[PDB]
Amino acid sequence: EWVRKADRAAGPAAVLAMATANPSNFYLQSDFPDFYFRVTRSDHMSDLKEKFKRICKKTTVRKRHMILTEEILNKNPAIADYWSPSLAARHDLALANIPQLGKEAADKAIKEWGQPKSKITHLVFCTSAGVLMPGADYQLTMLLGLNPSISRLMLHNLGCYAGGTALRVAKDLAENNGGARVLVVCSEANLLNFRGPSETHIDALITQSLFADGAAALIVGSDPDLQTESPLYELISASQRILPESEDAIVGRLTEAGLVPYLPKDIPKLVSTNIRSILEDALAPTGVQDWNSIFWIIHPGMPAILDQTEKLLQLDKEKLKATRHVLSEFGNMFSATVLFILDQLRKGAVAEGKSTTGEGCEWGVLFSFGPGFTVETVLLRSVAT
Amino acid sequence: EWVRKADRAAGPAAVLAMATANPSNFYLQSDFPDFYFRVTRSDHMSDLKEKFKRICKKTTVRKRHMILTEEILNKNPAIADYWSPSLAARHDLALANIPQLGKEAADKAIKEWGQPKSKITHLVFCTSAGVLMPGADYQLTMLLGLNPSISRLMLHNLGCYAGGTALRVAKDLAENNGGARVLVVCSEANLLNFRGPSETHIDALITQSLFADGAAALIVGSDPDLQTESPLYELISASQRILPESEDAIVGRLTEAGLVPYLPKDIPKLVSTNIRSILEDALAPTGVQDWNSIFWIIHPGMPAILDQTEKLLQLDKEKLKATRHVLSEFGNMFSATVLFILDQLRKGAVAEGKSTTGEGCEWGVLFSFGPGFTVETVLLRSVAT
């Protein structure tokens, strides 16, 4: 059966360009326990700093970019406390930084893409760093001079899986609308989550060892003009799932003092229990049988999950190389992290001279997660280099 | 040119079912100035109550449903103050009420629809009443027993235009995915916006005369099974637009004390300046030339805009009947209001015995607005009754 093309697109959505950006300011992880416990006026919790020193080392993170400088925290001490009224201050920083960081990545993706901005017909903007009305999607549209008639989808506070949601959304936008070009921006920062330490909230302390700032921007479109556009990946399928028996696994409470996390259930075991059949279902239409014949993007919000999945599916230790590089060099930038990893995977495949944007593989899987417990899974097809 | 149907849908997205729900508790507008100034411990502002009495009369609102009872406000006095730290309390009420109110409307829409819940493949959930992680989309999925693999899009804090966004989103979800059935829920309440009066913030006081609680639920799907499903409307086009010279027209600041509005620019003039060409562009593919040969849904967040548009396009005074009925009986329920109006328009067309779900008209326009200044415009096609 055939249908008239009419106003729709013929073929699957493709990533046509990708780029990332971060705040200029960064912290080496080796320096962070000292910096953190100083600026939060918590140097007296010697035994807690010792726990934090161990937490920070086991993250395998090396540096993290952050908007929050010692100077900004000094001018906003409520942000540095464990729990003081500070939401308005955090949202003032979000308005000054999140759309701007998104534009830095968007400029670079549009440059790689090579087409004029006026051909962008849709914008998907994800952030958990600040609820703005109008949103950062609006502010970015104004800063970039995009068409005022652009179709925007603003995704506030989905949490760490939203990079998968953004691709899932962009796929239908691109495929249903002939000529549509979708600018996808995940722009993230710890502005809502950053706070001082508490001996009674170790979960919250662990998040201070991992979360970081950064933005990723993509152009997604179907029916590429192969004379002016160069696909990097195809978005073949995109699915979302609540895992069984995962009620309240990850909760984020938005309060007067910003975002406060609550993580009672064991996240690594939840993923291990379910990852295999989720990826089997994803790979079912490809006829792949070797876990090592595909490329990998796994959200690294809990580094232990990377090791455990690697062992479980018996992956070649180079499979998660791009994933671990981003974790080491940038930390967990919330929903943007899997898109950083995608770009790093592409750049390493090209630099190392492989045959496909998927490190020589044809098929690939992108997997991220967050509150629900929710898992976003994307089936990707590489392109010949 | 033709394309293989493959996994996509053949025809345009259709509304297949619709229903609404509200909190049991309501307030007659004639009683509200007394109730409001009492519970906010503000009876001493006699001159402000007098302004409020006049504001409430000119709204043309008759009743409003609200979660907030005198009892709840007594147990949460910070909510009743103009500006006291209260976000966590407001979000506790959101978690206890917003997904639940959405389920009340969803149950009724699914009943009208007549198919099993397990055929729902997508959920679009809009609210500005509380940022939850996981969102009310998750909570509703759990309360309704929807498939854990449902594709959800959670839309937090877009503001009053999100009813148009929800239809715009559902359209692409339905049309790009063969067999997809999209549950659309706008569930809204004043939980973030409700506060005591200030002589120095008249804008905030006006919003207390209009905002109300309610949920609307729709089933949206392409390729209806005409032996089991009965389309009510077709979603023919859906567009979003930032109006020129409208920077900061509507701003909503999410603070320690909840949502605080800021409305410097003149909203009625902004709409009047731009409405006509926006609707002409919407109607361009229909060949309609008579503004009175189409049916109407206009977001009634500012009642003055209804009169002014009516005069400007010289509408038959019955055109905005369904719109004004919802405003009178329910007030402004944020993004849900245009969907209430759509359902009222359908119910009145059937009850009054007209030839189409569009009061006998073929084409219709749905127009809502909010921060940006953003306008969402939907072109609807009715169905023979």
Numbering used by the authors:
A (entry chain A), B (entry chain A): 7 to 391
Lines from the paper:
In this work, we demonstrated that PECs in agarwood are biosynthesized from a common precursor featuring a C6–C5–C6 skeleton produced by a diarylpentanoid-producing polyketide synthase, hereafter named 2-(2-phenylethyl)chromone precursor synthase (PECPS). The last remaining candidate gene encodes a PKS (PECPS) sharing high amino acid sequence identity with the other four PKSs, as well as the highest 93% similarity with AsCHS1, and this gene maintains the Cys-His-Asn catalytic triad conserved in all known type III PKSs. Crystal structure analyses suggested that PECPS utilizes unique one-pot catalytic machinery that includes the release of a diketide-CoA intermediate, which has never been reported in other known type III PKSs.
To explore the underlying mechanism for the formation of the C6−C5−C6 scaffold by PECPS, we solved the crystal structure of PECPS at 1.98 Å resolution. The Cys-His-Asn catalytic triad was also sterically well conserved in PECPS, in a location and orientation very similar to those of the other type III PKSs. However, a comparison of the structures of PECPS and naringenin chalcone-producing Medicago sativa CHS (MsCHS) suggested that PECPES may differ from MsCHS by the so-called ‘coumaroyl-binding pocket’ (pocket A), which is thought to lock the aromatic moiety of the intermediates. Despite this, docking simulation predicted that the volume of the smaller PECPS cavity is sufficient to accommodate the 4-hydroxyphenylpropionyl-β-diketide unit. The significant difference between the catalytic cavities of PECPS and CUS is principally attributed to the steric volumes and placements of Asn199, Thr213, and Pro267 in PECPS, which form a constricting loop to cut off auxiliary pocket B from the overhead main catalytic pocket. Notably, ITC analysis revealed that the binding affinity of PECPS to 4-hydroxyphenylpropionyl-CoA (KD = 18.57 ± 1.37 μM) was dramatically higher than that to benzoyl-CoA (KD value is close to 1000 μM), suggesting that PECPS could use 4-hydroxyphenylpropionyl-CoA and malonyl-CoA to generate the corresponding diketide-CoA intermediate but could not form the corresponding diketide acid intermediate from thioester bond cleavage between the catalytic center’s Cys166 and the Cys-tethered intermediate. PECPS first accepts 4-hydroxyphenylpropionyl-CoA as the starter substrate to form a 4-hydroxyphenyl-propionyl-β-diketide-CoA intermediate, from the decarboxylative condensation of 4-hydroxyphenylpropionyl-CoA and malonyl-CoA. However, due to the steric constriction of the active site architecture, PECPS terminates further polyketide chain extension reactions.
